[PDB]
Design a protein around this ligand. Sequence first.
Ligand SMILES: Nc1ccn([C@H]2C[C@H](O)[C@@H](COP(=O)(O)OP(=O)(O)OP(=O)(O)O)O2)c(=O)n1
Ligand SMILES: [Ca+2]
Lengths: 96, 55, 342, 360
Amino acid sequence: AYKSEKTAPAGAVVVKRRINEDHRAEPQYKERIPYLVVKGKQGQLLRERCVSPEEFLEGENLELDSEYYINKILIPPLDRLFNLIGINVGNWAQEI
Amino acid sequence: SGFEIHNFSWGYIIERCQKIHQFDIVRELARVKCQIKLSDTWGYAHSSGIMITGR
Amino acid sequence: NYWLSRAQINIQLLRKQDYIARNIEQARLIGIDFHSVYYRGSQFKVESFLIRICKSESFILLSPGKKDVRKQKALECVPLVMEPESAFYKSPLIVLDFQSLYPSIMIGYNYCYSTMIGRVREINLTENNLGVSKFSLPRNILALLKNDVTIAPNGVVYAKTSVRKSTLSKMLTDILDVRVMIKKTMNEIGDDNTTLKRLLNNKQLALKLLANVTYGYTSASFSGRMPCSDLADSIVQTGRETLEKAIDIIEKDETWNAKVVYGDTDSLFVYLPGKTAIEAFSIGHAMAERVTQNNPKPIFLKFEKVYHPSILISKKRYVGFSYESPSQTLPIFDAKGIETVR
Amino acid sequence: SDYFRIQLNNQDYYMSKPTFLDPSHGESLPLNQFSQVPNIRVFGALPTGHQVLCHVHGILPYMFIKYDGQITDTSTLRHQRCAQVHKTLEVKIRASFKKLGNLNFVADVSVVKGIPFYGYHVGWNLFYKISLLNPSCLSRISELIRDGKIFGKKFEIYESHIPYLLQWTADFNLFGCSWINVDRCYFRSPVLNSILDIDKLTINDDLQLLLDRFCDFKCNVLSRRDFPRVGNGLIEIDILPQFIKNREKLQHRDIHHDFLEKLGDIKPYVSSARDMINELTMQREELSLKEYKEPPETKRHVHQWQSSGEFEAFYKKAQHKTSTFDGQIPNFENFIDKNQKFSAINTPYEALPQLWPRLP
DNA sequence: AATGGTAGGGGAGGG
DNA sequence: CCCTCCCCTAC
Ligand SMILES: Nc1ccn([C@H]2C[C@H](O)[C@@H](COP(=O)(O)OP(=O)(O)OP(=O)(O)O)O2)c(=O)n1
Ligand SMILES: [Ca+2]
């Protein structure tokens, strides 16, 4: 149910890679596929990293994208909740 | 029942019987010997794609 | 033991969730079989209820085709979602919501297929368009019914309760009576049986969904088997009008210097600056009572809860500390739409 | 109880050649037999726990269309019109599927009275009751009639979004996962099936009492050759629509054919809600809780809307437009034309027992 | 093959 | 700066 491979979600890439390695690993409809993001080259797409937990744990030199997590997943919601007070958590994060 | 009946549990048995043994186990599991048709994509995508007569 | 534990554990999962018993009860109440409860959609349940009710009074139901539904008039009436004032509220915030707003409106205002006359504009006897059907009216039907009619806020004439009591009202009042009894029974017990409270909550949620999809049988502009754009438009428009009237009633009173800061299709968030959170309960009960007594018979406004410390971020997105009752001591973390619940 | 009770667990239908337990003729075309008739298979369990297969005969899907005749017919022109429309319908469907007479698609066409639901209608309305033989083709017949591929014009079709099994349950007061009460039934030739040792292992005293009470082995048991067993269950039975005692318990109100409610002439409309309420009351009695009640309150509502005045003016204009030139003012007692001779026609719930097998 | 509607927000990718 | 697609939630 995706318009194209370019518009597919990040978990779809992981599922497709697993299907490529074994055709029996096809997920059911509307099944949550776990994945993590890992450090990569500058300018790399988010879907390009898309490390599965099985691949992440077995990976020898795979590291969690601390900068991506801390900024994208943490700063926006905290700013949305805390800009109504008058402060932004971005300064606190950049000071550390 | 079964936690995942499509790729495992009853679905695996049905697929194996249909492919290797050429056996219609769905007819045998029904409560009527005769009178049971088409694949149900709605059931597979939403709930209980398999259909056995009377169960 | 690995596989034995797997099998026993899935059986125990089904037993703990009470799936089989709940589905059997739903099939018994609706009338459809066991499979159709989780296999078919909600329109099947609404059809079963409606047909069973209508067959006793010799009601012959129209069955429009796909083209007839596709040529139906578009829906123009929309719910009222007030834009919130995004801020931090340290003072108590009283929230009020109507119980079963749309079913209660359907019961109170006699909105149904069988009680509708036509749009107050463009009635011309020879040919009237209303929903997915074109029909004609008697010679003196309007003059005879000049007193026992009501006019919907969107401009659709409906018969009053005095003649042609609606069948949708009958099924809805039965469902809502069962739901109210379930809710009162669940509230009557405190910490005596947690599992029983969970089962009763599941039952009341199922009944509320049944009522909501009974409303949603209309407005089924896509994949609808018997929809009516005018009926759904009337229901939504009178819901919006009732909400606006409640806002005006609450904001007009000078005894409470309170202002409505946010509101969903039926909810109503009222800000009480510096009211000690113990006057807030009494004030909210007073507002709920006044609004309920200013509306039709089935329409009722419930006090819900109090958000003492609260943050309104955007529409359908807020978080606060909830105090359901004054006797409550530890607040319940109530969050809607924010990253904590997604 | 005094009824053979079978819970409605699963239900399905199939097409079969007619027998003496199923109807074979139609009222509209009495000289044309049925090629095949639909049967309903009900998989259920006795109160003792044993599974049972039930075959239901004599149930046919149906739908309603507008009546092209007049309310002044002499009860003989109605039969001729019904026969003509039956013949035309059968010929058109046989052509579309791709005299003579075999009745493979349409069983019978009858004229009934009714009150339409979509809109405010007060008077009696006449309808065509087209009974089909194959439930699977009902949507196709409805589509063909709707686009005017059969008659000259495009007809409006009533009671076609209701499925066959749902319509049968609604007609016969049957609920899912609920008892089906039958006064009598016909048994298959092997009363207790022996798949492996099912007859020996599952035999019980309660089952023996039920079989002795409801099976006579001289009249109830059917022929092995004519009615062979088809089910993988312990007991297999065949019933008739008259046997179902769950019907005749519905309350039928004829109040919509006139202004009976306004003139004053003559709460639990859902029958299934009472059972749930009773279960909840009994369950809350186990906690030593008090009785259930709700206090109503008085309301001081007047509820004019934003554009109430414009709507009132438009309603006044419409009343002026749609009104007879002078004349007597309408009255609730004489608005509906009385003495219309509508008693000869059949109410829809009275038309159901027609065409039933009516076995000896 | 079957499906009840409404509104709202946020993030990734491409212009 | 703006648009489209996708995910998920609140009524
Ligand atoms: N899934 C839903 C939820 C809601 N609504 C509509 C109809 C309801 O009348 C209205 C408000 O819904 P609520 O969730 O606030 O619930 P109710 O007011 O129906 O009931 P209660 O307050 O008892 O939960 O929105 C709907 O159509 N479908
Ligand atoms: Ca509500």
